[PDB]
Amino acid sequence: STGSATTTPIDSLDDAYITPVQIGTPAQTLNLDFDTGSSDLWVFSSETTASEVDGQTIYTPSKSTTAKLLSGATWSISYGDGSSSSGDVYTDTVSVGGLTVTGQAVESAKKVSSSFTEDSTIDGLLGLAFSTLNTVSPTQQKTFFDNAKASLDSPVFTADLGYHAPGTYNFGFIDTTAYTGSITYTAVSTKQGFWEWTSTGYAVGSGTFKSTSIDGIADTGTTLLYLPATVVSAYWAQVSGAKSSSSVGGYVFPCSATLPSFTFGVGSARIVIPGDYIDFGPISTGSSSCFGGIQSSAGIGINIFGDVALKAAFVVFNGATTPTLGFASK
Q: How many domains is the chain partitioned into structurally?
A: 2
Give bridge partners of residue 19 from the DSSP assignment: 32
| Residue where a domain terminates, one of 122, 155, 174 | 174
Question: Among 187, 196, 185, 192, which Cα is nearest to 218's?
Answer: 196
Do 135 and 191 lie in one domain? The reply is: no
Radius of gyration (C-alpha) of the chain in whole angstroms: 20
Do 140 and 234 lie in one domain? The reply is: no
Do 53 and 158 lie in one domain? The reply is: yes
Task: Write the DSSP symbol of residue 59.
Answer: B
Do 168 and 180 lie in one domain? The reply is: no
**Nominal resolution in Å?**
1.1
Do 120 and 181 lie in one domain? The reply is: no
Do 198 and 274 lie in one domain? The reply is: yes
Question: Among 141, 78, 75, 84, which Cα is nearest to 108's?
Answer: 75
Instruction: Examine the residue annotation and report whether 81 is marked as an active-site residue of this protein.
Output: no
Do 100 and 53 lie in one domain? The reply is: yes
Do 121 and 195 lie in one domain? The reply is: no
96 near 5, Cβ under 8 Å? yes
Instruction: Examine the residue annotation and report whether 35 is marked as an active-site residue of this protein.
Output: yes
Give the range of the structural domain holding residue 156, as residue numbers without chain letter: 5-174
| Residue where a domain terminates, one of 174, 204, 231 | 174
Method in brief? X-ray
State the catalytic residue, choosing from 199, 261, 296, 297: 199
| Residue where a domain terminates, one of 120, 148, 174 | 174
State the catalytic residue, choosing from 33, 35, 146, 160: 35
Give bridge partners of residue 33 from the DSSP assignment: 125
